[PDB]
Amino acid sequence: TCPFYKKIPGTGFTVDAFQYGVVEGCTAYFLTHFHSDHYAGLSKHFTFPVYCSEITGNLLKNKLHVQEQYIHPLPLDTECIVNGVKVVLLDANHCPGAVMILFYLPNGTVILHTGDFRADPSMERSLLADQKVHMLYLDTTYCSPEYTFPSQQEVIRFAINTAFEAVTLNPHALVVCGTYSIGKEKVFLAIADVLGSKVGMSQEKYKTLQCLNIPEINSLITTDMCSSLVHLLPMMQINFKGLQSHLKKCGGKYNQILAFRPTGWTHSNKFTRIADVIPQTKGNISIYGIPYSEHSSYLEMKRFVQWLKPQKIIPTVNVGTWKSRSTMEKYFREWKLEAGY
Numbered sequence: 001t002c003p004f005y006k007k008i009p010g011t012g013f014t015v016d017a018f019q020y021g022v023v024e025g026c027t028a029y030f031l032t033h034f035h036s037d038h039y040a041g042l043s044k045h046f047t048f049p050v051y052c053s054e055i056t057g058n059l060l061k062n063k064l065h066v067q068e069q070y071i072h073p074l075p076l077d078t079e080c081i082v083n084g085v086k087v088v089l090l091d092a093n094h095c096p097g098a099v100m101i102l103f104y105l106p107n108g109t110v111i112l113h114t115g116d117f118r119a120d121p122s123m124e125r126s127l128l129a130d131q132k133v134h135m136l137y138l139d140t141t142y143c144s145p146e147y148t149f150p151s152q153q154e155v156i157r158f159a160i161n162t163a164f165e166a167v168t169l170n171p172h173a174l175v176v177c178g179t180y181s182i183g184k185e186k187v188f189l190a191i192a193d194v195l196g197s198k199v200g201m202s203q204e205k206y207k208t209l210q211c212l213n214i215p216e217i218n219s220l221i222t223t224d225m226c227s228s229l230v231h232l233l234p235m236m237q238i239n240f241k242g243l244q245s246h247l248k249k250c251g252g253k254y255n256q257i258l259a260f261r262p263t264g265w266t267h268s269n270k271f272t273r274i275a276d277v278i279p280q281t282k283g284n285i286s287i288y289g290i291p292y293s294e295h296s297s298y299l300e301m302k303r304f305v306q307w308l309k310p311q312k313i314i315p316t317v318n319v320g321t322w323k324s325r326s327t328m329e330k331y332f333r334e335w336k337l338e339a340g341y
């Protein structure tokens, strides 16, 4: 049944709650972003109103065939009224179209649901700064101090310089980037731009990217693989077998593959600087695991919460074990005591 941390008290609302059938007393279903653990359950047969960003609504219509009459896109950074309740959608710094939702309850309580987010100081100057938040439903994916990772900018620098060096040494090398969901588009787009290439991909992935309002996209992506030296493949195919096979498919146009797996975190991070990352190599194939995260590090999450000073925190991730839950609650108390709220 629908868990409590997906229900917004004092409203008829649920968030990311599409896999439970008809939720009792839900008048409006919010969707924070287009990732499968969150949208699981939506299809063309859904007939309740869905509230979401413009980008998320493009993906619902084109990829899942949800009928347009049930899709209610809202502009960001704008006060809107839904079933008599004031709401605002804020950029979540997650994947394209990902939002946080501010709810202004009729009794005066204010609730922020972060969806999935990567906290950033820029958030401290949105409409969040303008009022107090009583309850926070928090993306706690990496709520433990061992989770450090570099900025997204440093990781893109590393990838660009690595790709550019490899292809300038060998003009017959192919660069491959793994994907399984929207998000992390900067990785493959930054590499293609430095190589003066388009990014080649399957028709299904090209379709997905055409839903995202990325400026100048027709200039950066293509379904003609042959004309491209950056290819996108399913994350599952980024291993020595899958890449040896793909290399056969290019008809002797290429004699080397350099491939990137954008992982979230990997325990190489507890010991290693980004500068120090090395690939796994077999023959003429090398695979780099790079720590490109679209979730908060532990320090970024702590800073955001100590800035916000919520009266109550409700975790939405890692809530399935008592040891996880107890750990997170200990960190929330530390943060509150250190900051003085």
Ligand code: NI
Residues within 6 Å of the ligand: 033, 035, 094, 116
């Ligand atoms: Ni997500």
